[PDB]
Enzyme design. Structure first.
Site, PDB file in Angstrom:
ATOM      1  N   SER A 180       0.919  -1.298  -0.124  1.00 45.08           N
ATOM      2  CA  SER A 180       0.047   0.134   0.105  1.00 45.08           C
ATOM      3  C   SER A 180       0.784   1.220  -0.132  1.00 45.08           C
ATOM      4  O   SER A 180       1.665   1.388   0.523  1.00 45.08           O
ATOM      5  CB  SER A 180      -1.107   0.088   1.030  1.00 45.08           C
ATOM      6  OG  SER A 180      -1.970   1.185   0.717  1.00 45.08           O
ATOM      7  N   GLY A 181       0.721   2.004  -1.084  1.00 45.63           N
ATOM      8  CA  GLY A 181       1.411   3.276  -1.064  1.00 45.63           C
ATOM      9  C   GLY A 181       2.825   3.060  -1.920  1.00 45.63           C
ATOM     10  O   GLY A 181       3.179   3.955  -2.054  1.00 45.63           O
ATOM     11  N   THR A 185      -1.228   2.070  -8.238  1.00 39.69           N
ATOM     12  CA  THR A 185      -2.513   2.595  -8.797  1.00 39.69           C
ATOM     13  C   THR A 185      -1.964   3.849  -9.868  1.00 39.69           C
ATOM     14  O   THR A 185      -2.148   4.180 -10.937  1.00 39.69           O
ATOM     15  CB  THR A 185      -3.523   3.360  -7.942  1.00 39.69           C
ATOM     16  OG1 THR A 185      -3.074   2.788  -6.312  1.00 39.69           O
ATOM     17  CG2 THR A 185      -4.822   3.012  -8.263  1.00 39.69           C
ATOM     18  N   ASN A 226      -1.288   6.052   3.049  1.00 36.13           N
ATOM     19  CA  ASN A 226      -1.455   6.816   1.885  1.00 36.13           C
ATOM     20  C   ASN A 226      -3.042   7.472   1.922  1.00 36.13           C
ATOM     21  O   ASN A 226      -4.043   7.103   2.453  1.00 36.13           O
ATOM     22  CB  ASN A 226      -1.825   5.640   0.943  1.00 36.13           C
ATOM     23  CG  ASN A 226      -2.035   5.898  -0.793  1.00 36.13           C
ATOM     24  OD1 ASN A 226      -2.180   6.967  -1.277  1.00 36.13           O
ATOM     25  ND2 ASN A 226      -1.823   4.932  -1.563  1.00 36.13           N
ATOM     26  N   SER A 229      -5.867   5.894  -0.886  1.00 37.38           N
ATOM     27  CA  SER A 229      -5.594   4.322  -1.052  1.00 37.38           C
ATOM     28  C   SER A 229      -6.787   3.895  -1.912  1.00 37.38           C
ATOM     29  O   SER A 229      -7.913   4.013  -1.742  1.00 37.38           O
ATOM     30  CB  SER A 229      -5.402   3.790   0.168  1.00 37.38           C
ATOM     31  OG  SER A 229      -5.016   2.199  -0.048  1.00 37.38           O
ATOM     32  N   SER A 230      -6.516   2.724  -2.652  1.00 42.41           N
ATOM     33  CA  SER A 230      -7.322   2.064  -3.498  1.00 42.41           C
ATOM     34  C   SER A 230      -7.384   0.863  -2.700  1.00 42.41           C
ATOM     35  O   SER A 230      -6.600  -0.298  -2.785  1.00 42.41           O
ATOM     36  CB  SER A 230      -6.555   1.495  -4.852  1.00 42.41           C
ATOM     37  OG  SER A 230      -7.551   0.762  -5.488  1.00 42.41           O
ATOM     38  N   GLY A 450       0.753  -6.878  -3.214  1.00 42.79           N
ATOM     39  CA  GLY A 450       1.913  -8.019  -3.475  1.00 42.79           C
ATOM     40  C   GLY A 450       1.526  -8.819  -1.882  1.00 42.79           C
ATOM     41  O   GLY A 450       0.178  -8.719  -1.347  1.00 42.79           O
ATOM     42  N   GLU A 452       0.849  -9.758   1.811  1.00 39.82           N
ATOM     43  CA  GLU A 452       0.416  -8.873   2.807  1.00 39.82           C
ATOM     44  C   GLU A 452       0.767  -9.565   4.059  1.00 39.82           C
ATOM     45  O   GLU A 452       0.586 -10.804   4.629  1.00 39.82           O
ATOM     46  CB  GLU A 452      -1.105  -8.650   2.882  1.00 39.82           C
ATOM     47  CG  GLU A 452      -1.580  -7.563   1.967  1.00 39.82           C
ATOM     48  CD  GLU A 452      -2.989  -7.077   2.086  1.00 39.82           C
ATOM     49  OE1 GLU A 452      -3.837  -7.903   2.717  1.00 39.82           O
ATOM     50  OE2 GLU A 452      -3.098  -5.896   1.380  1.00 39.82           O
TER      51      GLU A 452
END
Ligand SMILES: [Cl-]
Length: 743
Positions: A180-181, A185, A226, A229-230, A450, A452
Site C-alpha cells: 500500500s502506497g 495505482t 496513503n 488508497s485503492s 503484493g 500482505e
C-alpha cells in the site's frame, strides 16, 4: 530529439547525467571494497569497507570507523566497480549480491531515478514527490522505442507490450503489484494513459479514462499509509482491434474493503464518495437527502479525520460527477447512487436500544425512516427485518427478536452488502459501456497488492497471499522458459516450490485450509475454535508449511514464499458465508428504486454462485485470472515503498530489502547470479575494452574475434565466459575484474 538532447528534461529526469568523456580511464582506481554489516544484528544496513588486504581464503578490510575486520572471500559482498553505479538494469551488475543491488538502486534513487530494471522486472520506487515524467511530451518519446533504447520507465514497458502485441499477434499482461502506497495505482493509471495515447483515435478513450475517477470515488480512501488508497484490486483489460487501435475495455474488481464503510481506524477516512457528497451536494440535494456534516454521521465521525490535506471534497465531487456523466450514467441513476450512499449514512445513524426485555427496539425512527426513504423501501418492513428476522428453525419459520448487538451487526451487514453490490453494479455498468464482445487483442493490467504481512493477518490476507503464491510461481515458470530461450537463441548450455504452499491452501483431497473452512461453514453452530482445531488437527506437525503456535489458540502460521505469515481465525466462518438475513433481502427486493432493485433482484450481483462460499468464489476467480494470464505474454512491475513514512529522499535499506526479498526480485537475481548474468553484445564489449589488449581497435569488423583477443590478452579463465551467437556471456564477477584491468 530529447534522447539525444542532453539538455532535455528527458535527460534530466530520466537519465544519469553524462559528462564530456566516455574514456575507461576516468573511472580508474586501485581501490577494492566490500559490502558489510557494521552490526551483525541489522543485516540490511551495510557499510562499505575498503579491502585492506587479502589472504587466499579471506579478505581483510577497513571499516567506516577505521576498525579492521576479516571475512571469508566466499561470504564476501564485493562492491561493483564505480562504473556500474547507476546502470539501468541490475542484470548488468557483475557482483550481484543483495547489498550490491540495494546500492545500485540507491544511487539511482539519489538522482531521482525511480525506475530500474532487474532482468525481467521493472522496479519502481515511490519518490514521494512530484517528477514531471508523465507529460504527453514524455509519452511521445517512448513511442516505438526498444527497452534498450530508452531509460527505464513505466511508458517503456507499456510501449514494449503494445509492440509485442502488434508484432506477435499475442495478448499481453502487465502485473503491477506491491504494498500500500508503493505507487501501483499511479503506475496503472500511467499505463492506460499511455496506451490511450499511443493507440487512440477521443470519445471511447475518454470514457475509458473517466471510469477510473468514478471507481476511485467509491473504491479509494484515506488510510495511515496513503491518502488516496485503492482498497480493491483490479484487472483491467484494454481491448484493441486488429489494427492496433483501442476498441474497448473491461474491469474486474476484487477484495473491496467493505469493512471500511462502517469502521475506520483513527486518522483514516471512509471512502471518498461519502465526503464528496456531503460537501459537493447542492444545498438543494442535502435536504432531499437529509444530509448534514460528517460529524453528524457515525460512519464518518469516528476517526477524527474528515478531510484530506490539499483536497477539496467539493471539487472532487464535481470531478466524479462529470466522469459519470461522460461514461453514461443517467441523471437519475446518478441520484439513486447518491441516494444509496446517503441511505447508507442513515443506516449507521440508527440507535439500537434494548431495555424493554433483551430484544432491541427503536425509540427514534428518524434515521430509520431517513434511510427507508432514500432507499425506496418500507421502514416498518425494514425495521422488522433488522430487529426481528424470521429464521428457519427447522420446519418452522419464526421471527427472532434480536438484541442490540446482533441488531447492530445486522444493520452493519446490510450496509456492506449495499456497498459491495453497488460497487459491482458500477463496474458492470461501466463495462456495458466500454466492453467489447467482439475484440481482437488485449493488454490486461493487474493492479493488486503484493504479499500482505501485517501485525494481524485475517481471511483477506490469506486470500491475497494465496493469489501472490500463484503469481510468484507464474513468474518463476515465465523466467525459467525465457531464460532457456535466451541461452538457446545463442548457443549456450543448461515443476516447482510454491506448489506445496499452494496445496496447503487450496487443496481438495486431502483438503487444504480453504476446503476445511468450507466444510465448517455448513454447520450453523460451528465456531472459531472448532475451526482452528480442525486445521491444527489436519496440519500441525503433519504439513511442513504449516505451524501450530506454541501458545496462541486462535492463530496458525503458513510458510509463504515471502516467509511465515501468522493468521488469526476470528470470524472466518462469518466471513466465508458473508451472511445477510433473508428478511432484509426481502425488504430491499421491493425497492421503489430502480438501482436498488438491481442490487437485490439481479443474481449476478445479489449472489455468489446464492450457493458457493466466499472462499470458493475467491478460488475460482483466481483460477480464471490465472488462466487468462496464461494465455498472454506478461510483464512485471514491482512497486517499492522507500520507507514507511511517506517521505521523499528517505530510502531505508531495511524497508527496501525486505520488499525485494518478498517480491521475487532478489531471488531472481540469486538465480541469475549462478549462471551467466552478464551478456554483452560483442561490439559493445570491444568498444569499451579494446584498449585492454594490444592491436584491438575500438571499431573492429570481427567483434567476436576481437573480444576473444582481449580475453586472451588478459588470459581470462575461459570457464568464466561463454561465446554466444551475438554476445559474450560472463559469470558473476568476471566483468568486474575485466573492468578492473590496466589500459
Ligand atoms: Cl508529469
Amino acid at each position: 530529439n530529447p534522447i539525444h538532447d542532453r539538455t532535455s528534461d528527458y535527460h534530466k529526469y530520466l537519465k544519469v547525467k553524462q559528462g564530456d568523456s566516455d574514456l575507461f580511464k576516468l573511472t580508474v582506481s586501485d581501490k577494492r571494497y566490500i559490502w558489510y554489516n557494521p552490526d551483525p544484528k541489522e543485516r540490511d544496513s551495510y557499510e562499505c569497507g575498503e579491502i585492506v588486504s587479502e589472504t587466499s581464503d579471506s579478505f581483510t578490510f577497513k571499516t567506516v570507523d577505521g576498525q579492521d575486520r576479516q571475512v571469508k572471500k566466499d561470504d564476501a559482498n564485493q562492491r561493483n566497480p564505480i562504473k556500474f553505479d547507476g546502470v539501468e538494469d541490475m542484470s548488468e551488475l557483475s557482483y550481484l549480491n543483495e547489498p550490491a543491488v540495494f546500492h545500485n538502486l540507491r544511487v539511482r534513487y539519489n538522482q531521482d531515478l525511480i525506475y530500474t530494471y532487474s532482468g525481467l522486472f521493472l522496479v519502481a520506487v515511490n519518490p514521494f514527490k512530484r517528477i514531471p515524467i508523465y507529460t504527453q511530451e514524455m509519452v511521445d518519446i517512448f513511442k516505438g522505442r526498444r527497452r534498450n533504447e530508452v531509460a527505464p520507465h513505466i511508458f517503456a514497458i507499456s510501449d514494449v507490450a503494445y509492440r509485442s502485441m502488434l508484432d506477435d499477434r499475442q495478448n499481453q499482461s502487465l502485473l503491477i503489484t506491491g504494498e500500500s502506497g508503493a505507487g501501483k495505482t499511479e503506475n496503472t493509471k500511467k499505463v492506460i494513459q499511455y496506451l490511450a495515447s499511443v493507440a487512440g483515435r477521443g470519445v471511447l478513450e475518454q470514457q475509458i479514462l473517466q471510469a477510473n475517477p468514478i471507481l476511485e470515488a467509491f473504491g479509494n480512501a484515506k488510510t495511515t499509509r496513503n491518502n488516496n488508497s485503492s482498497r480493491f484490486g483490479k484487472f483491467i483489460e484494454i481491448q484493441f482491434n486488429n489494427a492496433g487501435f483501442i476498441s474497448g475495455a473491461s474491469i474486474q474488481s476484487y477484495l473491496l474493503e467493505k469493512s471500511r464503510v462502517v469502521f475506520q481506524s483513527e486518522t483514516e477516512r471512509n471512502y471518498h464518495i461519502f465526503y464528496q457528497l456531503l460537501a459537493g451536494a447542492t444545498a438543494e440535494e442535502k435536504k432531499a437527502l437529509h444530509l448534514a456534516g460528517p460529524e453528524s454521521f457515525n460512519y464518518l465521525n469516528q476517526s477524527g479525520c474528515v478531510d484530506i490535506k490539499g483536497v477539496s471534497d467539493s471539487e472532487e465531487f464535481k470531478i466524479t460527477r462529470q466522469a459519470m456523466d461522460i461514461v453514461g450514467f443517467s441523471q437519475e441513476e446518478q441520484m439513486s447512487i447518491f441516494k444509496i450512499i446517503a441511505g447508507i449514512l442513515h443506516l449507521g445513524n440508527i440507535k439500537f436500544e434494548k431495555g424493554a426485555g433483551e430484544g432491541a427496539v427503536l425509540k427514534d425512527k428518524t434515521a430509520l425512516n431517513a434511510a427507508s426513504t432514500v432507499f425506496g423501501v418500507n421502514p416498518s418492513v425494514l425495521e422488522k427485518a433488522l430487529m426481528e428476522p424470521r429464521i428457519l428453525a427447522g420446519r418452522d419459520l419464526v421471527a427472532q427478536h434480536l438484541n442490540v448487538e446482533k441488531s447492530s451487526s445486522s444493520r452493519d451487514a446490510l450496509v456492506k452488502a449495499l456497498y459491495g453490490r453497488l460497487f459491482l453494479w458500477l463496474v458492470k455498468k461501466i463495462n456495458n459501456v466500454l466492453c467489447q464482445e467482439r475484440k481482437a487483442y488485449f493488454i490486461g493490467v493487474l493492479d493488486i497488492s503484493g504479499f500482505e504481512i501485517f501485525k494481524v493477518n485475517s481471511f483477506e490476507q490469506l486470500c491475497i497471499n494465496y493469489t501472490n503464491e500463484k503469481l510468484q510461481q507464474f513468474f518463476n515458470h515465465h523466467m525459467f522458459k525465457v531464460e532457456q530461450e535466451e541461452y538457446l537463441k545463442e548457443k549456450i548450455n543448461w515443476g516447482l516450490d510454491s506448489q506445496a504452499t499452494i496445496d496447503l491452501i487450496d487443496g481438495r483431497q486431502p483438503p487444504g485450509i480453504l476446503a476445511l473452512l468450507d466444510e465448517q461453514s455448513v454447520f450453523p453452530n460451528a465456531t472459531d475454535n472448532t475451526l482452528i482445531t480442525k486445521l491444527h488437527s489436519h496440519f500441525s506437525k503433519k504439513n511442513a508449511k504449516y505451524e501450530e503456535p506454541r501458545f496462541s489458540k486462535t492463530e496458525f502460521g503458513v510458510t509463504h514464499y515471502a516467509g511465515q505469515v501468522m493468521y488469526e481465525i476470528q470470524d472466518w466462518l462469518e466471513k466465508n458465508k458473508d451472511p445477510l438475513q433473508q428478511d432484509l433481502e426481502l425488504c430491499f427486493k421491493d425497492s421503489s428504486d430502480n438501482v436498488v432493485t438491481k442490487l437485490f433482484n439481479d443474481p449476478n450481483i445479489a449472489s455468489r454462485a446464492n450457493f458457493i462460499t466466499v472462499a470458493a468464489q475467491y478460488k475460482e476467480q483466481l483460477a480464471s485470472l490465472m488462466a487468462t494470464l496464461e494465455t498472454t505474454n506478461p510483464h512485471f512491475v514491482r512497486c517499492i515503498i522507500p520507507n514507511n513514512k511517506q517521505l521523499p529522499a528517505k530510502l531505508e535499506d531495511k524497508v527496501v530489502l525486505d520488499q525485494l526479498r518478498c517480491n521475487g526480485v532478489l531471488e531472481g537475481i540469486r538465480i541469475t547470479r549462478k549462471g551467466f548474468p552478464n551478456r554483452i553484445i560483442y561490439a559493445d564489449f570491444v568498444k569499451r575494452y579494446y584498449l585492454l589488449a594490444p592491436n584491438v581497435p575500438r571499431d573492429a569488423e570481427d567483434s567476436q574475434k576481437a573480444t576473444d583477443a582481449v580475453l586472451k590478452h588478459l588470459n581470462i579463465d575461459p570457464e568464466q565466459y561463454r561465446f554466444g551467437i551475438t554476445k559474450i556471456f560472463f559469470r558473476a564477477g568476471q566483468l568486474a575484474r575485466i573492468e578492473e584491468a590496466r589500459e
